[PDB]
Every structure is written in C-alpha cells, then in structure tokens.
C-alpha cells in the first residue's frame, strides 16, 4: 500500500487509482438504469430493489428532482448520491438567481463534472462513488441526457444505461438505433416512450417487472416528475397487451 | 478646499497633420503662494506622452505608477506601449480608485508607431475617457482653454504651425487664470522626432 | 473541511526527477494524438474524437476550444483537466489583461498565464500536476501567428509544427519531412489531415476528426456591423462538412 | 477518504463494528406516531435507576435513539438541534422529519469524505410527527438512511428485526400507539437474550398525534409498568 | 526543509542534482561589458528559434539572467524579481543596485528552504548587471538561496569542466570581444553534442553601448549568433 | 489489529476500537485512588493524594467548580485543570446569564461533549483524566463519573484509579446503608474514608495522604486537608 | 443626455445623442454613448459617465465568460440580473442609469436600470436630462406593432426632441438596431443636424509669433 | 403606490395600481407591481423599488431551493423568509411587502410586513401611500367569504378611490387571482374604474 | 507658526529652524532643534502637528540608517527625498495622516552638488534653490527672489539668511525665539552655534 493507492496522486503509469476505485463503488448497489430521448421528452428508468421488508418502500429512491426542469438518476451508494443531489439543487437555484434563467441540463452537468475534477486533483477530498445521469427538455436543445462520472468526465447521449449490466442494455439500444437510423424514439406521448424504455430493459435484462420493481422519471417541456406505482402499473399493462 | 484647486496648472493636447502637440504650464502653488517655477506636468513612456493636472502629489504619484506599469509592460510584451492601449491602462487604473480617487485630469498624446495615426485623449478623475480627435484640455483654466481651442483650431496643421496654435491657446488661457502660468513647455511630436520648447510668458 | 496535505506533493527524488511531473507526462503519452502546424497566413490545430460510446453524441464534447477570439487550444491527456484549464485560461485573459488594457492578450502572454497555472499545481500543497499537454495557437497584431506547447511542468515552447500524445514521435517525424516556411493555410490543413491518418484507428471522416484554425478575420462571425475597426474572430472551428470536403481531394 | 480496490470504505465498515457492539435500540412506527425503545445495561447496583437517559429530543416533535459510541450520538443530536433551530428560524415551521433526516444524513456523510476525520460510530433511529404523518428513520455510519416500518440496531438487532417482521405481517392495517409501546417493551426484552449475564433497564419514549399531540414524550409511570408487565408475561 | 544527520538539506541537494542535467550557462565579466552564453536543451528542427527564450531573461534595462533548471520555476522568480526592481525605482527614483535584487531573490529561495513544506525552486541563476556603484557585476544563486560574486562562472551541466577551463584562460584586462570568444570556446569544449551550432545557443551582452556613456543589453538574434560563431572560428 | 491502528484518534481498528482513547483510559488506572459517594442530603469526595518524594507536597486531587459543585481527579493532572476551568466557566455563565445554578446533570453533558471532540479531531489527543463530580442542585445530591471517552454516568457511589476495584466492590456491598445517612455529614465521610481503605496496599492513611470534600443541603462545596481531616483517620 | 429604447414587431432599437458635458461646458461634441455588452445586447447610459462605461465593461466581460462556459448566446435577462445585483450592492454610489436592449434566443428585450438597482420593463423608455422631451415625443407617436423603419424614425425623433430642447443633450444621433433574425446594426452618426458653420476668419498665426526661451530634441529611444 | 390583498371563499386576490414616480414625474405608468415568488405565492411591493426587487429576488431563490428539497412551501414560510430579510436588515431597507398565497390545506392567506419587519396575519391588507385614503372604505365594505366577482369588485372600487386621491397611484389596476383552479391575471383600464 | 527655511548656495545647503515650542498661551521651550540627521550628508527639518512631527522624523531616520547599514553605503539626497515623499503620499490617504511638512537638505557626493527639497504633508515634492513651510514663506520667497544668487558662498548664504530672519522678526506676529542654523556640505553637517547675536 503506497501513497499512490491512497490519495489522488499519479502512479508511475499515469493512473489515479482512487478515481478507478471510485468507479467500482458505483455498482456497489446492484441497480441498473437507462435513459432515452423521445420527440419532446426524456425518460429515465431505474430498477428498484427493496430487500428488507422493514423498509418503507416510498423512501427508497435513486431518482431526484433537481429543479422544476431537471431530473437526476444516480448509480452509486445513497449517501454519496444525496450529497450530489443536494449540491446540484443548490447550484441550480443559484444559477437562476444570478443569471435570470433556468440552468440547462448540460450546464449543470458540466458544473458537477468540474466539482468531481477537483476531488481528482486535491488530496484531502475523495471522489464520490457515483455516476450522475441528468435529464430534461432543454429550452434551447430539446430533450437531453448528460452523464457525469468520478473522473470529472461528462458527455451527452442519444440514450444511455448505467450499472452492473450496463453492457446488455447498451448493445440492446445500439441495435435499436442501428435499425431506426434516427437519434431518438419517434413517438409523441411520453407514456409510449416510457413503455419503450421498460420493454428494452426487459429484453436486455431478461426479466419481468412488477409495479414495485421500477422507478420512472419523466422530463417534459417545463416539468420533470416521477411516476407512482399506479402510473407504472398502468404502463406495465399496456406493454403486456402484445409483447 | 477643493483638491483640484490647491496647486494650479493646465495641460492641452492637439492633433495635426501627421503630428501631435502637448503643452503645460510650469506653476506649482499653494493657494495664492507660488512655490515652484519649474514644475513640469508632462511625462513620457517610450513614444507615449502623458500630461497630468490637479493635486501635485497625485501628479507625481501617477507618473511613478505609470512608469512602473509601462516598464513591466515592455518586459512582458517586448515592445513599447501604444497610445490607444496606454489610454485604457490609465482609465482602469483611475477607476480602480473609484471611492478614493486621484484628484487629477490626465491627458494622453502620441502617435501609433504601426498605423502612424495621431492620437489624443482625456480623462476625468475616475477614468472616464474623452475620445476627441481635435484637442483635449485639462486644469484650473480649462474653460479658458476650451474657448481658445474652439476658436484657434483647424484640422491638419503642419507641425510648425500647430506649434503656434497650441502655444497661443495655452498662453492666453493661462493669463486669465490666477493659478496657472509661470512658464510653459510645449512638445511637438512627429513619428520620427520630438521637439521641446520652453515659452516666454508673463511671470505674474 | 481543512487540508492535512499542506505540503508539496511533487518533491525531488535523489536523482533529481520530479516524479509526479514525469508520471503526468506518461498520462499525456497515453492520450489521443493532437497536433498543430503553422503556415504563413494561419495556424491549424487538429485532434481525433475518440468516442466513449457510440450512444454518446460526440459534438457535445469539443476537444478544440476558443480561448479568445484569436486564440484556440487542443490537448492530449486527461479530458477533465483540460476542461478546467480552459475555464481558468478564459477567465485569466479577462482578469489579467482585457479588464486592464481593453484588448485581448497576445498569444505568448496568455500561454504564459496558463503555464503559471500549471506550474502552481507542481508546487502548492495538496495537489497533483495537471495531466495534460496543451497546444495553443493564436494570432496578435504585433507577433503574427504562433503555436505553443505547454507541459504539465508549466514549460512552454514555440513550435513551427508538433504533435503530442500517442503517435507523437512518428507524427513529429512526418512533420519534419513535410514542413517549410512557405506554406499557405490550405497546405497546412492538408498536411494536418495526412499526419492524423497514420494515428487514427477507426473511421476517418469529419465526424471523428476535430479541426480548428487561426486564420483571417471572420466578419460574418462577429455578430454586429457598424464599427469598421472590429473585424471578427480569427479562430474558426471547421465543420464536419468542411472536413469531408478536404478528405475527398486528400 | 480512502476507497479500497473494490470500492469499499474499510473505516466505515469498522465504524459499523462499533455499532454492532453497542446496546440494542429500536423504533416502531404506528398508525399515527412513533415509538422508541432502548436497552440500558445495568453495570452495577450503583447506577441510579431512571437517571441515565439515552433517548434524546430534538426540537419538540423528534425523538432520537442510538447504539454504539454514546458520545458520538450526543455529537449528532447536538448537530441535529442546531440544524433544526436554523430551519425553524428561517421557515417558521418545525422541521419535517424527512428534511431532518437528510440534515443528519449529510452531516454523517461529510465525515467520510476527508482523511482528517473519522466516521461516526453510531447507528441512529429517529423520527416523529409532521404535517403529513408519522416517519421513522435509521441512519448508518456511512450516512445511508431510509424510511422504516420498524427498525433495530446494536447487539440484539437480529432477534429484534425478526420480531419487527412478525408485526408488519400480522398487522397490515395499522397498529396503535398504545399497542406499539407494549410491543417495544416485548421486543427489547427478547433482544436482551444475548447480554443476559448482566441486568438491564428499559427506556421507552413516543410521539403520537392522538396520544401526545405530536410532541415527543417519555413513557413513564403506569404506562411503563403496564408495558413492562406485558413483556415479562410474554417472555415466560 | 528538514536536515539530514550530515547537516544537509535533502530537497536542496536533490534540486542541485536536477540542475546539473540542465544546459550549461556561462557568464563572463570583462572591464567594458559582460557576456551571457547558454546551451539549449536538445531540441528539434521544428522549434521556433526566433520566438524562443528558455535561458536568457531581461530583469530591467540594466540586468539580465541566465537560467539553469526548470523554466516554469524560473519564470515565477523572474516575474517577482521584475516587480521588485520596479518597486525600488518607484521608492527611490534610482535603478536597483544589482546586489540588492540578487539578495532579494536569494532570500525568497532561502525561505522555501526553511519553512512551509513546499519544494524548493529547481533553479540556479547567473545574474549579469551594471550599476553606478560596482560597475559590471556577475552573481550566481541556487536553490539554497546562497549567492556569490564572480569574474567568470557557469551553471548547469559540466560546471566542473567549464570552471577549470575558464580559470585557465581568463585575464583581468580582457575586453568584451575576448570574453565572447572565451565563452563560446568553453561551451564548444564541454558540449554533449556533435557540434555547437547557432540553433542550440542563446547569447547576450551588456556593453558600454556602441557610443554614448550609457548601457545597452543586446540579446542576440539567431542570425547574429551564426555570424559570431564564424568570427571565433567554430563556423 | 493493534498494528497500524493506534496512530491517532481519527482511525478505527478492524474491531471497531479507538486505541488512542483506550490508552487515555489507561492513564486513569495508573493514577491515585479517589472515591465518591452520596446520600439524599450530602455528597462526598475522598481522595488519596500522592507525593513524589518524602520531601515533597502531596499533590491535590480535588478542585472546586462552583459553590454547589466540585470534582476529584485521577490521571493527568494538567488535563483536570483544563476541564475544571471549563466547568467553572459553564457554571459561571449559568449564574450570570440565567441567574441559575448549573444542574449537575448538565455539567455532565457539557464535559461529555467536550471530551468527544478530542476523540474525533486530527492532531489532538483525548483527555487523559478521570473525574468524579459532586453537587447539590435543585434535585438534591448527585455524583457523576467522567471517562475521557466522554462517557458520564450518574451513580450513588464509585471509585476510580489504581486498585479502585476494592472500594467499588465495597460500596456495591454497602449501598443500602450509606444512601440513608441523611443529615449527618460526619458519618457519610466516615463511610467514604472506610471505602477508600479497601484500596490500600499502600498503608495506614496519614494526615497528608488524605483529602476530603463535601457539598450538601446547607453546605457549600468545601475542601478539607491536613489537621482538618485528622478526626477521620 | 438623451437615450431612448423602442420595441418593434421583430426586435428592438436604441438611440442616443452624442454630447458629453462638464457642468455647463461641452467636452465631447461627438462621443459614443451606445455600448456593447455582447454582440446582440447593447447599452445606453446616463449619470456618472465613468460608472456607466465601467459597469458595462465589467458585466460585458463576465457575460462573455458565461457564454463560453455555457455554450450559449448571452441572454438580456442575464445582463440585467448581473447589472442590478452589482448596482444594488453599492447602494447607489455607482451612478449608472442604463437602458439595456437586445435580442437573444428567447426573443427581444427592453429594460431600464436605475443606480440603486431597480429595473423595469417596457415597450418604449427614455433616460437622461433629455428624457422628458423624448418621452413626450414617444407618448405622442408610439403605437403597437411598429415596423423597423417606423421604430428607427420614432427613436430618432425622440433623440431630436432632446437635442433641441434639453441643454444637456446635443449634436448627433446614434442608433442601434437589433432584429431577431439578423446581426445587430450599429449606426454611428445616423443623423448629423448640427454641423458647425464655417468660421468668418482663419486664425492660423504667422510663424515666429510665439516667443521661445530655450529648445532641445527629446530622446524616445534607448 | 396602492396595493392590497384580500382572502375570499375560494382563495386570495392581489391588486395594485401601475404608477411609479420620481418626484412628480411618472417614471412608469404600466409597472407590474404584482410579483410571483412561487406558483401560488405572490406579493405586493411598496417602498424602495430597488430594495423590494432585491428582496423578492432573494425570497424566490429561497423558495425554489425549499421546493427542490422539501416540497411546496406554505404561505407562512414565504412570509417568514420575507420577515427575516426585512427585520435583519431594517437599517438599510425601506420595504413594505404584502404576502399572499394559496395552498390546499390552509386555503387563502394574507400576511403583511410593514417597515419595521414585523409580520401580521390578516383577512385582507392594504399598503402604499394611496392606502391611507381607503382605510375607512375598506373597513366598511369588507366581508369574509366573498365570491370571486364580489372580491374583484371590492378591490376595483377600493383601488379606484386610492388612485383618485393619491397622486403617486394611478394607471391600470392589475390583479392576480389565486385558487385551486390555478392562477389568473386581471387588468382594468382607467375608463372602467373612474366611472365608478 | 513654526519656521522652516532652507537655502541652496553653490557648495552647501543651509537650513534654519525656529527654536520655540508653544502650546496654547505658553512658550514651553526656546531651544528646540527641529532637525534630524538622516545620514552623514543629509539633513531633515520638520514642522506641523504636535506629536506627528518628531514621530515622523525619527521614523524616517530609523529607515535611512537601516539602509546605510544593510548596504554599507549612503543614499543620495534625491533617493532619500523620494523615500520621504512616498511615505507622506501613503500617509495622506490613511486613517490618520501625518501632518508634517519637511525640508530635506543634502550634499550629493557622487555629483558634488548641494540639493534642497521641499515636501508638504500631502507628499508634494519639489527641488528648489530656496524654500520654506508655513507663513514664513510669504515673506522670504520674494526677499530671496531679489537677493539670492546661484554662485553665492556659504558665508554669503548666511548673510542672506540673516536678512530672512530679520524680516520675520520684524513682521511675523509670533515670537519664534530665533533659529538654529545648520550647514550641509562635502564635509558633512555642522551647527553654527553663534546666530542669536552674531
Ligand atoms: Mg482527492
Ligand atoms: Mg484524503
Ligand atoms: Mg477646470
Ligand atoms: Mg496666469
Ligand atoms: Mg441494524
Ligand atoms: Mg440641446
Ligand atoms: Mg392618482
């Protein structure tokens, strides 16, 4: 155990092991999430696992409402997740106060990536073991997905997936966009874009879901919101009548 | 009293055909008492000229400050500062002291060593730029100077003629102000050379 | 709350090496190639868009950045380190120069300020050097066109042409063979594209290559008319289509 | 601030060992409130009965109990009180329980970001009544917290959780404040099974909409005696 | 900053160790001027000679330095030195005496040697200046913050060889043109390269300024070095 | 397990232990014995003072905190001074601001919280002293025991320091007797001195060995040393 | 000073006069009071001249950095929010009074800012000692849905009211047009109705007129 | 300035005139004095325009933050944030604010925060220089549980009287209706309300 | 008020300073030396506010002496006067400005010329053939405008000074109790001990 394993200084290879180890922490919760863009919306799906029957299921969540327009799904342990959520909210509220308009998705993402970059460079801060997926319908850019990781890296996606079985879902989606040739789901209502996401999660993970197995966030022009079990129940019935 | 009145003094700059001129009086006073017959108010940094009127302690200080900053400039940039740029550096330096200002009325003259165009400018005590192409005036006899200049001035004057005009402007405006005068120095500036003349004037 | 590493994390070793600077340079080596070439009437900087995922949209991640209207940059090494250096470089062009002389800094000076920011990551307590090398290309009235390299130590050197990152030794070779003091900007772009092909694994089109110039003033990019002595940025990021057009006659 | 090669924080995991080491404490959510109970190990006949209180109040409506390093818990409650005062000052309303949860949450999590601090050596069970019902929470040394139908921590956590699971099963339709108090006495008596070599004192508190007016009060006198008897009867 | 059992400062020693790999720099003081010559680090055809300064820096109008070590470290020190000279000029209306500037810079270096847990600056300087008190002057400073005065001196690689060669050929009555010759001979002999060509040198003088009574710093341009390399017979 | 884990108070052992704190606890066990006990009307501290030499003073173990409160120390003496000065201030602040005598219980909480911050801050040590705090407040006589871990418990009686286990077993045995000595200071002191006896491999406790303090219903906290203790040996 | 701002169907226009004064005296007969915050957001100021230029350059600089940071065109509401927060902080001590107008991705905008940090929105506005003369022209001729040409006419006429009736305003009219589609057009000296008449006589002196004491050439070089 | 807020059967209405003056000069005849700090929490401002805008901007910031973290804030919470800002900085603020809002629990509420920074919960509230002339009319004509149309009438009548007498008041009457239905903006031009 | 005159002849600079210290209605002392030697060849005289006067002088003296020892060298009159000016110029914008006016008289050894500097509390510096602070200037400047010659001897300069003091003794309302006179030339600084009736 040298110092190059314990703090964010370079190893002789040019690597930063603490950053690399922080990426490992993201899967620690064994949850898979995926995000897709509709024609005028953006949808995020995440598995919802409640092992203990002593838990109040309503309080178990990895999706956060950052602002009126921006949602965030987190892959990683809850405490680090809530640290990033709180900060993002504060940054979102501050941006609006100082600049007189709502903070865009991509701009909040860039800012959260910049915070992460600092923990990558300063010794006394550890990175956070989380990957952050930001979604909205940007007033200037249309539906948007931006994802940040412990490296301070971020980019925009047509669609994306995160978690242990990230690859299954990625290739599933890559295969879809290979066929359709466009960079979104050609569909008007968000209800149908949510159904699509659930379907392609089912085929990629080879698993059926009940209403309590899922967690859904929807971002439309000027609101991001989450679905309750019943809006999800209604969505599961719709997919069931054909597939 | 009013800090811009304690010591006296005037500065005027004019443009001509391929030249600039800048002049000042030589008086340094303490209210009614004239103290110094040799107090110059024009300075230069490379080919950039700066006259300053107002409180003499700030005249001296700002010369020292602009020597400092142009010296560093030349070292980092490996060229002498140009009139346009220097003007901006005066502005922001004065504005930096917005709520504790230097009580001065600076005046910038010079020729751009690349484009060759004559350049003059003026500032209030907090660094607001007066961008005028004909003449700029400053000091306890500025009303008298504005009058003289607005009457005597015409564009595109030959250096030898521009000399007469700026001298006459200064001399006669000086003589209507109790706190200015006591000698006068005039700089005629061309891209290639600079001539400096001490004028004969009323010593009262 | 409150740092326990108030000492330099880059210290000297018995042989005189500064380990963390070396290790950071190793990080640059592992990075995607980027290059700059200087012509008589312009400078070109180019690099490869090595995409993380095919599901990602690579236009939402620019490796080439405008620093001032007349200065642009590109890098090899760690992306996030670049991104923050760009923010700070842009800010420092304002705080240290534009807010003082009312004009944008000449290239060597902005480069000098970036170099300072990286130098400090080498000496201050509790930090590691930046894991990048930058190529900074620009123009200014009195110095003309220029290209500079800046390394994690804070050193900079002016280049006629150079490459950094992966295939940099081969590419520097290819450039020494091709460069001369009579090149037009079109020639330099052509040479830049060729040099980059030896480095590029996959597809080689205007969607996977990122290329910007410091050329003549673009008055159509200014955003306003009226002031005739304001002529527009010299920095111009070439479009996907403009690239593909020069790959057909390549 | 140190991640292991597989993405763990060993220091936090060791902090948990100090919690597992502590006295057992519990919290039960009823149809209109919350009940907290804790095991006070009587080390010696010299300890004054009823006079070494563990359950702490935050504001007027929140109860807190913890297992692990007791001082660490008082440090947290102190912080919780400062954090709730500040909320009330700006917003006039008493701090909602979820809002309070995250306050503690972020504080605890903060103590796992920096090499110059150690994580807290407690798990805290807390909650109370707000604008929209009863809330019960449990908070680990990592800063992880969730809502709970029922919660236990410390030495007797395993048998306590087993009893909590039974209640959730036999009573989906609610469960009263008065009943939950009794059950708390029972569950603490059963969980005391491990540490049976030393004697123990019971401590219960509750916060009920209809029983305490949404204020946190200590269970004392006849109600405590009733709940003790129920537990002593259901142990034999 | 700590001491070894030998009463040596580890980090200072290792800094000096680093400097002995840097291009050699030579300073020679004559009666009517000073010479600064230094060898650039093994470059390339594509390096822009014209717009490059890695070893020679103007401090004010009367003082220059030759650098051996980390350039970035040196730029940090050079900039504060420049500022210090301007403070002096503002305070006294006199150009700073060479020693005063040298002592200050040396004191900054010394500070890193004694507190703060920051690494020292990996830099050694050769200062070449003129002032109305000591005339022409040559000084050297290194990461310890020690400084000494010289008639001729070198820093960086091969100082051992270069010092011995300078010791042998230097004489007190030398004109500057003689000192230009000595410096280039000495670099020629101590180089680790096939030949000493113009593209691998930086060169400067501080003369009595053509014809005047004042002092002129001449930083040699590339083409000028090429000529002065022919005159001295190394082509 | 005990290896790389006892460097500072900011490190847990794989067992969940804080060794620095455990080592601070050992400085107590090393110190000279002192006993505290109370009835409903009074509370008593009895302390065995320790000289360095037969030419030296027997160093003080008892410090007064307010008119209604004081403590005995066992461990690092300088740490007791720092903690009692703070306790003196907290008692002071209570009087000045609220015209209120600080509850003995609240004194306990304040000490606990102060010790705690030193068990969690880098580059600072835990306190290395044990304390026995007695007072008479608005709910009568109290005795507290303070451990540098921050643990404070209210008791009827106790003892801390070397060989204290004897007295602690004694008081455990005598519980029902001494709790009832109401309105008789001299008998409660007698039981205290007798309790401290079960902790002597030392000797015959002398006029200079012994330090007694009392507080109660109508007696402010007062210290007895020398001739004034003679009547108890 | 007379500055105005008028909204039209497809954008916004600002205009000002070209006179600066030191009390009763005219310092610059043709100065530019129209300032750029970003390419499509422009600014006119009255009050302490230095304050209005400085607050314009400060906020202009920070808006450039925001624009680069965010990859977006600068918005007028950001220029406004930053100006007002800055001005407020200084409780009126920075005597800047500003009409700020521009087009951004959300449309066209016209705002006023007062030195204490209050703002208002409108379709037509004026500031400066000349404001009442121009406001009376605006209140007489402003209609909803003006064309570009009608807007330029109206704004130009308002500035003339100030030029002719307010002793604080004079000389020429500058205009800036900001249409939603196009680049902003700055029209320096749009009108020049105050040409100085030729003087009656030439005052050029015969050479030698001025008496000289001593003389010497000055060195620039080194 | 004439400003008021009235609670009625279904919610709350806010009204204001649209005149702003520096001296006897009308700087703005069409000011919007009704300021939203949350979907269904609005306020009326009086006093220094700079002060009340800066305050409103800060409150809106605090309630956006509140909402991200804790959900929808009560009107009481809005009022408290205003008070806090107004009380704590009473030495450098001339600010008179009326806070009005609607949620589903507490229904329609009005709070008034005058110059000192004190808070007052009231069935209706008037403020601004023009309010002084309508104290008698308002006290005489206000009833609890009025219909929407009745309330618009009361505000319209009151503010016309205030506009008639106070030279600092005038222009149009703006209103904002706050109910379960949502949010409604109203305007009334001089030719309507003068004829009353 | 306080009298502080100075005159630069060809080979020296003479300073003359009033000897009275007056507070209210009482003359507390009549042998006050309003001077500090800055270096072997530089003299400073001062007048102004009661405390600040000496405090400023001794402060300057400490600094110049420190320089001399650190450099084993004596600053030129011109350099000392710039250091003094800057100190006063910083002082005028501080919380409580030094209200002190000074004359600096020095013999520059490098140039072989005497030099006189007049500096007011604002930090206004000027090099002069003769100068004065306070009201005394209102009489002496015109006197010396008539009487002074650039090529005067040290003895001729003392005569000119004897004229200045006579005038002030005739016309000034205050009794300043004569002056202490000090010469600064190539051999350093010396006091003319006979002036009161010489
Ligand atoms: Mg780190
Ligand atoms: Mg750390
Ligand atoms: Mg004037
Ligand atoms: Mg005159
Ligand atoms: Mg548990
Ligand atoms: Mg007019
Ligand atoms: Mg009215």
Short mmCIF file of C-alpha atoms in Angstrom, two decimals, chain E residues 2 6 8 21 60 63 85 111 115 126 128 135 137 159 167 169 171 179 181 194 196 198-199 213 216 229:
data_model
loop_
_atom_site.label_atom_id
_atom_site.label_comp_id
_atom_site.label_asym_id
_atom_site.label_seq_id
_atom_site.Cartn_x
_atom_site.Cartn_y
_atom_site.Cartn_z
CA UNK E 2 14.45 19.11 7.19
CA UNK E 6 25.04 15.19 7.94
CA UNK E 8 22.41 18.85 4.78
CA UNK E 21 21.43 17.97 -16.13
CA UNK E 60 15.25 45.51 -16.10
CA UNK E 63 20.21 43.50 -15.50
CA UNK E 85 13.08 46.29 -9.42
CA UNK E 111 12.56 30.86 2.58
CA UNK E 115 9.56 26.85 6.22
CA UNK E 126 23.57 33.77 -13.38
CA UNK E 128 24.66 40.00 -15.21
CA UNK E 135 30.26 48.82 -12.36
CA UNK E 137 28.85 42.56 -11.89
CA UNK E 159 30.36 23.26 -14.47
CA UNK E 167 40.09 29.51 -14.67
CA UNK E 169 42.14 31.34 -19.88
CA UNK E 171 42.56 37.55 -17.54
CA UNK E 179 35.15 37.29 -23.37
CA UNK E 181 35.48 34.21 -27.62
CA UNK E 194 28.46 16.71 -32.12
CA UNK E 196 27.88 23.76 -31.31
CA UNK E 198 23.53 28.57 -33.80
CA UNK E 199 20.22 26.74 -33.25
CA UNK E 213 28.06 56.82 -21.83
CA UNK E 216 22.84 48.58 -23.68
CA UNK E 229 30.20 31.67 -34.40
#
